[PDB]
């Protein structure tokens, strides 16, 4: 099943992936949501094992971690204006988040390429490309019945920015 997949993930990872999956299921579709959750789960498990086997150091994720935190912060600044403006009016903050997430993608690919086979690399590009697209943020912020689900996601991203990775 899938219960053994999520157990090797910290609780903050389960919360974040759960809220993300809810969001994808709202704006996109169910198969896209389960696909993205399988992707993030596989990536995170393989990374955690690559660090536990000392194949890579914890500092090797410094740039990925920084870019992820910056994208999450930009998504918080944009979440401040949810329900008061449209996604086209908030294009600045959201494209800042998208650029940060693209940096996170490129550094993740840079780090994991000597280990993954090319299919898992393309899986990285697909996951980051979908979850970090400005069209994705545009669809989320324009949707009306998400404030409840988006609040859980932003709250999950906030407490990741509190766990300093060092
Ligand atoms: C768009 C983004 C897609 C990303 C998909 C690929 C997965 C990321 C791969 C790189 C790993 C990151 C660094 C790992 C360090 C680490 O994991 O440490 C941090 C904690 C601690 O864990 P610990 O104390 O047990 O171990 C520590 C021993 N070293 O773990 C986690 O909370 C993992 C959380 C993963 C982040 C979620 C990724 C998905 C984000 C989706 C939301 C963004 C879009 C929002 C749309 C509106
Ligand atoms: Na909602």
Domain coordinates in residue numbering, the chain = 1-166
86 CB contacts (<8 Å, ≥6 apart)? 141, 142
Q: How far apart are the first and last CA of the chain?
A: 33
List the resolution, Å.
Answer: 2.7
Give the closest residue (by CA) to ligand 1 atom 29.
Answer: 58
Of 54, 75, 71, nearest to 63 (Cα)?
Answer: 71
Q: Is the CB of 132 under 6 A from ligand 1?
A: yes
The token pair that represents 110 in the structure block = 């840079």
Let me know: does 21 contact 36? Beta carbons within 8 Å.
yes
Report how far ligand 2's centroid is from the alpha carbon of 43 (Å). Answer: 27
Report how far ligand 1's centroid is from the alpha carbon of 41 (Å). Answer: 10
Ligand nearest, relative to CA of residue 74: 1
Of 27, 43, 46, 57, nearest to 142 (Cα)?
Answer: 27
The token pair that represents 146 in the structure block = 């998400």
Whole-angstrom distance, CA of residue 128 vs CA of residue 135: 13
Way it was determined: X-ray
Give the closest residue (by CA) to ligand 1 atom 38.
Answer: 40
């Amino acid at each position: 099943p899938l219960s053994g997949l999520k157990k090797l993930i910290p609780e903050e990872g389960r919360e974040l992936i759960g809220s993300v999956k809810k969001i994808i299921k709202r704006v996109s579709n169910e198969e896209k949501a389960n696909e993205m959750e399988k992707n993030i789960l596989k990536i995170l498990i393989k990374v955690f094992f690559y660090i536990d086997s000392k194949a890579i150091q914890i500092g090797d994720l410094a740039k990925v971690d920084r870019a992820l935190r910056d994208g999450f912060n930009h998504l918080d600044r944009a979440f401040r204006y949810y329900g008061v403006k449209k996604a086209a009016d908030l294009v600045v903050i959201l494209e800042k988040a998208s650029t940060a997430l693209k940096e996170a993608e490129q550094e993740t690919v840079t780090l994991l390429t000597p280990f993954f086979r090319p299919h898992n690399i393309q899986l990285i590009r697909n996951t980051f490309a979908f979850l970090g697209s400005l069209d994705f943020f545009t669809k989320v912020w324009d949707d009306l019945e998400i404030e409840d689900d988006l609040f859980l996601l932003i709250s999950a991203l906030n407490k990741y920015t509190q766990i300093e990775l060092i």
